[model samples]
Target chain A: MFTVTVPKDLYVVEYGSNMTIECKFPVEKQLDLAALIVYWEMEDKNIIQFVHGEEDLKVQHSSYRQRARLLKDQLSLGNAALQITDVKLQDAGVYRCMISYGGADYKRITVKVNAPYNKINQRILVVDPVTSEHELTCQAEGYPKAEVIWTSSDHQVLSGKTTTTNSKLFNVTSTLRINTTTNEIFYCTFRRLDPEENHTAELVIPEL
Target chain B: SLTFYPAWLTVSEGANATFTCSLSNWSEDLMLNWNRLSPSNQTEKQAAFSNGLSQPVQDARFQIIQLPNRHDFHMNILDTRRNDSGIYLCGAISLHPKLKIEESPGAELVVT
Candidate 1:
């Protein structure tokens, strides 16, 4: 299982200077840059830009208008470096570099700017009903895998749950099921060691 | 984006048929692929050829003809058969020196 790794700690750069974030990945052949979707975000103001690939930069629901250029030449060498010029303090906070390489190749880097930072967590839960049996799966891919648990609306932990992490990619997936059908709240939560990090997503299976 | 001539057609099995892919801009480095998609939504077969400002490999059945202006890639599939009955795609790959990388956008072909 080939993997991509970026620096764990965010790189800090002074405003007004050119900044480049390097991403190193072990891929067999020259990657098709056209097929990759690269994007970056300054989480503080929710300023986001789709900076990579063949398309132009797009800001999603943000008031500030800034021009971001992608240095493509270096990407072919697996550098995955993004250069942002004329930086501003608003650019402070976490800047995440994400690349989706179609067909299970996904990697990301989080850049923290300035002091006093916050983290964003996410999760995905799946529920499937097979012949005479119910299957529940929870998937979360982040800095650290999230914790998944089954419980009722009143907050009672259900037993017989299995959780496992994929060694290759450092991701976690879990599943839980019950013999009888009833109303229940199956929730997944991620709590980063940093107080700023935490998130929860739940799916309710109505009485069936 | 890619555009193919004879957008839709039917050919008899065991006969010779030619499908051409034309482009407007000419680039020295270009890669084209021919793919067959089955009704099952699966890629049945694929044949790829790359010509970085040169001629493709010579084969009796496969031929790539480049126009003088460099805007067109005329591919010749000598013989058509029942097995060739599927959706075909002629894709173009281009390399950008500034970015120091390559990109691709191809045309599609269909034979019945």
Candidate 2:
């Protein structure tokens, strides 16, 4: 039975960044690249392949067509590492490296892609000059989802309606309705549940 | 209060795995949810149970079954994969006058 080793079982990278997942075999075995069939897959999807000492892209999965490649130089030294460029949120999953001679050996690792920063947007939804009742909305977009809070100038948490939509990434929107005739300042804070990062936006409500 | 049995688990790939979420002083109106925290800290709602009915949020691997004579929740994975390894929590959502959610301590799962 052939033995395969992965330097790190868990690999984490920032979204849109490049990272390499390493798979190392016994160097002393001196396996011939020409005689071995090597491939990498994610969730049963083809990532890349090595056949007859050459990299094959014809069968590469469309999602990783130009984003993933094998490190040819490392193959000779019993390394079957995969390099991923411009990583995306969908890229976060379990990846498997398979090497075959007479029998097959597999090494699996998990890749976690995280959003490095949060993008916040604050705007006025409704302006009422008659009753001085205004509606404000704050939206934040990030990975791993984020908790948004609306606060008044006095640092009191304001009652707001929050809605979240997730697709590999998360977009959260919070709307707060306020009745104020005088100029006031409001704060919107977006806190990522993971990584514990936060971003705040300050909105100045103009006097009506 | 919500708690997970065996707070931690280590299972082999492709093996069958089961977990139990117990609730103390829970009411019938409260619903239970199973959530997973990925190694990347991504949170996913696996399944939810209420009134003897179960619903899978996104993943199909998770199955909820009612335990006879027990008010606790039972979850089973038909086939545990490598990626199934993560931290799981049992949460209760109150359906009373005010909606509130409470989560139990995380139960770590390691698959080999």
Candidate 3:
């Protein structure tokens, strides 16, 4: 009987970083490279594969084409670990490593991709007398996206429009429109839902 | 409340992908927004569909379809690429006195 082991069942990494998930079997037993069939899969999709002493690209999934690999040097020592480069949020998921000699042995590892703290930058407030309203806009950018909420000094929630765009990072814009003749203070809060953090902006509109 | 169907999908390059967002226990003037979170964690607004109208960002490759009285939002991506793989979230904003904002759990799109 063959047994598969993983040093850690859970792996976490920051976005844009690299991580290696270790899968090992008994090094004492001589691994037959020619008779061995090893592969890694995530969500039932093939990540990497090796068969008959050769890496199989035909069955390798496209998303993991150049990003995932089996540690070639460590395979001879019964290591079927997978190394992923430039890890991204889409790469976070449960991965399975399978080794088949006489029978199949499997191990699973869960990967978590964490994003850095998002920063809130420029904020602008404009009042329109003709429309009898005040408009406030703020900008923030980062990963995992951020939620923007606007509130009045009286602790009343305000409706706003939020737009998020991405290039290499997320750029978020939030706009609040207030129609009031009384003087009041408005606050805009930017929040990251995961591992919650808040950044806020305050604006005051004088009575007109 | 807002929900997305087929929470996850895996497709080949140059293929087409679609996501459906449905609303429940909803009322008042509502606006729907479609946003994409890149694999690298960058988020971008793709388009907004409201009142049977679609307003997309400049040069965006997204299409929106509005269902009849059901008020469902359908988003489609054409000629998908490797970089298009990420999480897609649907947000709803109610333009009422309560000012309620709801976001769906999001769907994962994988481009092989």
Candidate 4:
């Protein structure tokens, strides 16, 4: 990766919220702004074209056509800040602050998001070692049925014994049993089909 | 613009491979077309397999992958051989009634 100094690395925003990411740069000296192609890039996959001189101007992503924008004034001052509104999960990724003058320069920033406070945290623990017990458990406490599946990365079907029990508080606990050695990596993923209600977690246990 | 993932694919002689073409957040009203081309000493238009008509140099070792929603529009070379190596094309037709139908650039697949 090309080396460029970015004072910050991570930015946090709530789902359906808006935030601005600013990239600060120390210009070596004053240079002609008209001759340079100073723009912002989202990874190597995208480029944001900004009009020269105007700082408060906003540029939109092809995907977020009318939704995303960049504060042009802060950008020309060496602060490439992008203002994203009504943020969604798909909008989370690394964005680069790019400038092209003598050549191209880059600074990467990552975006993170958090769900509502009432959301339940689901966890999955898997014990797969070179030589260990194959038994594992799937546990989750949610309001409705959370779709749970036990599978490997290669998309193989495993016929292990599983048990689920519902409690009076409307919570459920599921346990899966495997007769194989403890060394095989088993993956248990939990997901709620309804996008409105869902959480995910994973776990890996070493050989006992 | 049309963007393709796994921009390149490599497979040993006899293995199956897949490539995906997707338009970035564009409208869904579009049609997709697939074509194959091989290194024939013939002219570009005269090249065999340009359209979805015939099999090129059929040694029983080549096939195309077509799927809905651009899921798996790839070229599968069964028992792949040196002769199976060539360029492939996947063009998507824009569905806008007023605008002209735009086609995606040809995806060059070099099968080893």
TM-score for each predicted model, relative to the true structure:
0.33, 0.59, 0.47, 0.34
Tell me the TM-score of chain B in each candidate: 0.64, 0.88, 0.85, 0.51
Clashing pairs in 2: none
Q: Output the better candidate (1/2) by lDDT.
A: 2
* DockQ agreement of candidate 4 with the native complex: 0.02
lDDT of 1 by residue, A48-112 (tens): 33334564434443444554555678667665566667655555544544344531122233443
What is the DockQ score of candidate 3, to 2 decimals? 0.01
Report residue A8 deviation for candidate 1 (angstroms).
30
Task: Residues B1-112, candidate 3: write the lDDT tens digits.
Answer: 7888779988899998888888885453566667776444333557766665666765357777776756576788778999888898776754344223466778998999
Worst 10 residues of 1 chain A by lDDT: A115-124
Q: Give the chain A TM-score for each candidate.
A: 0.42, 0.84, 0.66, 0.47
Off by over 4 Å in 4: A1-4, A28-31, A43-47, A51-61, A119-208, B1-112
Please provide, for model 3 over A125-208, each residue's C-alpha lDDT reduced to its tens digit, 9 standing for 90 to 100: 457786667777878776668888888888788899999898556778898877755566778888876557687877777656
Docking class of 1: incorrect
Rank order (by lDDT, best first): 2, 3, 4, 1
Using TM-score as the measure, the top candidate is 2
| Residue lDDT tens for model 2, B1-112 | 8888678888999997788888886777766767776565434567777676777766668877767745677777658999888888777755344324566788887889
